[PDB]
């Protein structure tokens, strides 16, 4: 239970030992702290240890609504029958809603600025406040829920609170699906992998296991190679916002006070649409704000997120790179030369073999992100297979997939096909110029931007009764 | 048992798959696409006992791998000309809809 | 743990000029948390760190 | 697991060197499909009365046996191309592969 | 609750209730007793209940040697350095060895003939005494292990007890794999499934999972449909044995006294070679002796083995017939008409729907054994796929498979290829006339029989130092 | 529990003409089982129903 401070290796701790001549941590008796993930069957001499998913695997907006029953009621506004989600009672972002505050045992957002006294937020997922960028997306979808629930009350005044909440929840879940599979995933996998692992939806298959796979929780960490070392904020004309325009990320983690007291989400959303993401390259894998200084303000020592990813894969007993290549139907290099051809980079192959001895032992994240990106994608062949394979199961295996017959009417389907993330940002913030679709590709202002008008708004007409 | 008629998802995911009503539901084990690999066969990770090899080779310290392979000078960062930082944030947001792996509290 | 925005609920329960249906729906909400009276709601907010000074009567 | 070894262990351990319990004894079975229980995770179909399985009542196993498996044993057809040893080797082989323990009375 | 005497459905019981029209059990307050299989993770509200395999999955003769270190030492003769398995000290079979006696609390074998006081036998598996025909096979392999260890001692006088035991065990294991894959499985599956699921052995593949699947523990009960309702015993001229040559099975279960005091194993092995199995047919699935009188002598009521099979599959949470058809790639009937086509038997299809309502719900053993048998095999296509798939994993996934390079010398493999089950019967009994090769097909005396002298013995010359 | 064929190992342990190599390996075998002296071995056989 002493994992954060002690360095001794007793359960449940699995600290990361410090090598010699480390660039930062000069004392080798120190360590990087690490709690082993909770086993599914504690203390068993029979079952091979597995870990738990605390969330619903489905793409169901459970980051807004929660995945347990009491939490899901705690996020709801139980003062009236308008079916709303609960909002913050002390603060607002130019009138508009903010997420409510959580009441935690050990609150880490209070440590990031002691005079501000701004605790962490309450959303359907516990990690909402990890980054004000993340917090802003959580806030925007809270607002989108309430906007729909208000609009549906206009159409159907006799609908009570439960009916309203559920219908809003249903639409928001479909919007997270449409955005994800129409706009996001094609840009992760690239067109070739997208045809292969996500062919055209037919219908629901109740023999498709929709569970998250253990390896996926480590493979989808590819995104850490996209993290930029600052938070960017922009004024109404997309120029640097006046307080702090380029904040080092080591000073925004759990910094919920920056949303409340430093202009809200409008400037963060603008910097997200008008700043390029980091490009993963074999000699520039991940930035030192996350490799050297992760959570520096709220812990005795800053963490190494790539290293945590690799220790975690070991905590979960995941197989190594070649076993996942074999699984995926990809060739398994044995020698440095064979790995140099797979990576089309012999210098990096040699470095991996220097460390691991064999491509059988390369950790899945490290081998996965070392691979060369697919044409028009941001992952290599191995990660494409794991990520794509997972999302096909979440689609085919979801009885409530928005395109499955019976979930939505044919007209509501034709309406939902018009939604998009830039539209959602218009309807719920003071932002009035947003990205051309595809939002995840558009990154340069003002070339890739347009006014909140050229974009079709969602038509809720077919929701009347 | 799961209701024959269903308009909305349950919060926990229960009863999506009617034949196997916990599939995709919350507070359930991960599925394994490959059997686990652990030092003792069933619970201890590689890197736990000093001197115990993995498949004939010593276990590399994760932080060592990170220093030798992931480290790079911040001033040479390449910005992706065809992806916005919203590409990054949607991934984290979406990650937090699919999985969270609890670990014990301090 | 009592949440901060549940303090707004306490005011709705103490407002004499409030819909009786909305007050039943809140007392029922608190009952599922194991809080079966207005004073027990007050004491959970008190114990979980919040300013209860306007409700000491 | 020892890097070198001439003989099987008695428990099956260390056959597979990357995953040394696979095939060893006193371990859980592997699931080729996800399990199908009345409550999702433990109670079998047939346990709670009135609970249907996929839209239909659960047939008593004794009643399936009575109506489908039962036949007049005098009419038994001997298999011209198999011996009783074919049956018996099956049972012995089974007992080389799986035993599912129950609690004791 | 005491599942063997009470009919209350509390854990760990799950008793079979009695239909009102029952042909045997006239009291509906009664039940057939039933203990749920032990769960791998007791009382967990997180994992999905699964069951435990107490045995090693590999085809390694673990029913001779045990699957746990303490048991395997009790089966060895620890009074010298000859590498032998322990034999009965009180009784012999015309000089030949018999299995030792176990020491159980509540020994069922004692209940089958109180005055004989012959307890159950001690072997690698706990069910060795369930049928004296099974016991015979156990005894036969125990005498072979010892015969080999004696012979190896002549070749290698310097070898100690451990080497002699390990070396004979290695041989016996290879004999079981050879008889199983060369002679048994081709006659279960037929040539077409044999080609499809058991293609030619290439080599050890460490990525093949060798575990027993849960459904296999039900599917492989296909063999209950081969069970003849008598135990036949034949003298040295292959004629009915003078005392009781045709004993009902309800009087031989757990009757280890019949092995000891009524002629030993030769008359039983002769009856197994010279009596036909029962043919499974869609209108003749299983005989009343196992369906009505299973363990009648050691139990308050006779059990119904086909009914237990279906209750057990529900206990294990196995999916229904159609889910397994889909798993195997086979068409899935929805109507009685389509089921009639799948079974080539509409009358049988109607009976199943009356019971189950949908093919989705047919228990796997009932579906499996209702299907028509494949050509020159003794299962239908569903069971062939489950059984064949399982035995391919146990072969490709076994590091000690007898043909895997390094396990046996090229010369040793040449010699083992020559072994046969009829030869092991010659070497270890008083039988001088045995079935022609493919003992599993040969079934009629004298047409299918040959003198022992005409068969080549196992040559252990290449086992020398 | 105690097995009937383990009674023959007692005959060997008491047999004064057998060799000590054999007696040592049997005392170890019973020792792994918790029966450390010939008195403990006998009493275990009696306890578990033998003579
Ligand atoms: C050693 O044995 C390995 C295991 O082999 C299995 O067991 C033996 C006994 C045989 O029965 C054998 O036939 C079995 O395959 C064997 O590795 C296996 O190789 C296959 C072929 O590459 C792998 O199949 C690939 O799987 C990926 C990922 O999807 C899988 O798992 C998900 C999650 O459960 C399922 O939803 C899927 O249905 C898959 O089962 C697929 O993406 C991939 O399909 C794409 O593959 C090809 C080319 O890319 C095309 O058909 C399409 O583009 C597909 O879209 C394959 O289906 C299998 O995962 C792998 N298993 C393991 C455990 O690694 C290995 O090859 C053997 N080696 C030797 C030398 O014998
Ligand atoms: C509904 O979805 C089902 C699931 O499909 C998987 O997931 C979706 C998301 C897609 O990726 C889909 O492409 C995936 O397959 C789907 O059922 C699946 O159907 C396939 C094909 O019919 C089944 O494969 C067959 O399996 C048997 C058994 O072996 C399997 O399991 C063992 C143990 O895991 C492994 O060792 C094997 O590698 C297999 O994975 C095989 O014997 C069989 O192959 C033999 O037959 C084929 C065809 O004759 C030959 O080419 C081979 O070489 C062999 O001779 C197939 O591999 C799969 O088991 C089944 N899964 C489930 C869960 O039922 C279903 O068809 C979908 N239906 C619709 C309408 O969409
Ligand atoms: C329970 O098991 C008992 C064995 O422990 C069975 O007892 C045996 O049953 C048979 C059949 O009735 C008897 O056979 C008869 O034997 C007599 C004389 O035999 C003498 O010689 C034998 C040795 O050769 C010896 O065992 C006897 O004690 C006698 O010294 C003949 O005259 C008959 O024609 C016929 O062969 C067995 O003798 C009898 N006793 C024994 C010890 O075997 C009993 O049948 C079983 N009960 C049930 C219900 O199955
Ligand atoms: C899927 C995933 C997981 C595993 C979740 C689980 O199953 O428990 C983790 N990440 Fe990563 N991430 C972190 C920070 C500070 C980020 C900046 C906002 C960030 C981004 C990110 C994105 C872009 C992404 C997918 C495209 C992603 N995350 C996926 C993802 C920080 C962390 C930390 C800390 C962890 C846990 C590390 C550990 O101790 O094992 C983490 N993320 C896991
Ligand atoms: C594989 C198997 C199993 C399940 C094993 C496990 O994993 O625990 C069972 N059988 Fe069946 N069997 C029994 C009797 C009296 C037989 C006559 C000699 C017999 C034969 C037989 C054959 C030929 C066979 C394969 C070809 C086979 N068995 C496989 C097999 C009796 C039983 C009993 C009783 C059970 C347990 C029933 C329950 O309570 O679930 C059983 N066999 C299981
Ligand atoms: C361990 O192996 C030894 C040697 O192979 C076994 O020894 C033998 O034991 C049998 C049975 O006790 C003896 O057989 C018989 O002889 C007696 C007279 O002494 C006779 O009354 C019987 O009818 C039978 O013919 C045999 O003589 C004996 N041989 C030796 C060399 O000791 C021993 O039993 C084995 N122990 C176990 C537990 O298997
Ligand atoms: C910590 O939080 C406080 C808010 O309590 C930040 O203070 C703002 O900073 C300005 C300029 O220095 C001050 O005038 C006020 O205290 C705040 N602004 C307004 C408009 O009230 C403070 O800067 C934060 N410090 C750090 C290091 O994060
Ligand atoms: C596992 O084995 C250890 C050592 O024998 C024992 O202390 C522990 O209680 C066992 N665990 C379980 C769950 O039986
Ligand atoms: C509930 O909704 C009302 C009306 O919109 C609002 O004033 C109030 O603050 C909301 N309550 C919470 C806890 O969000
Ligand atoms: Ca979810
Ligand atoms: Ca075995
Ligand atoms: Cl996995
Ligand atoms: Cl299964």
Residue numbers in the entry:
A (entry chain D), E (entry chain B): 279 to 743
B (entry chain C): 166 to 271
C (entry chain F): 47 to 103
D (entry chain A): 167 to 271
F (entry chain E): 47 to 97
Text lifted from the article:
The heme enzyme myeloperoxidase (MPO) is the most abundant antimicrobial protein and contributes significantly to oxidative killing of pathogens through hydrogen peroxide (H2O2) mediated formation of highly reactive oxidants. In 2017, de Jong et al. were able to identify a small 8 kDa protein that has evolved to specifically bind and inhibit human MPO. This protein, called SPIN—Staphylococcal Peroxidase Inhibitor—is unique to the Staphylococcus genus and is the first known protein-based specific inhibitor of MPO. While rMPO is a single chain monomer with low heme incorporation, native human MPO is a ∼150 kDa dimer with each subunit consisting of a heavy and a light chain formed by posttranslational modifications, which are linked by disulfide bridges. In this article, we present the first crystal structures of the complex of SPIN-aureus and a truncated version (SPIN-truncated) with mature dimeric leukocyte MPO showing full heme occupancy.
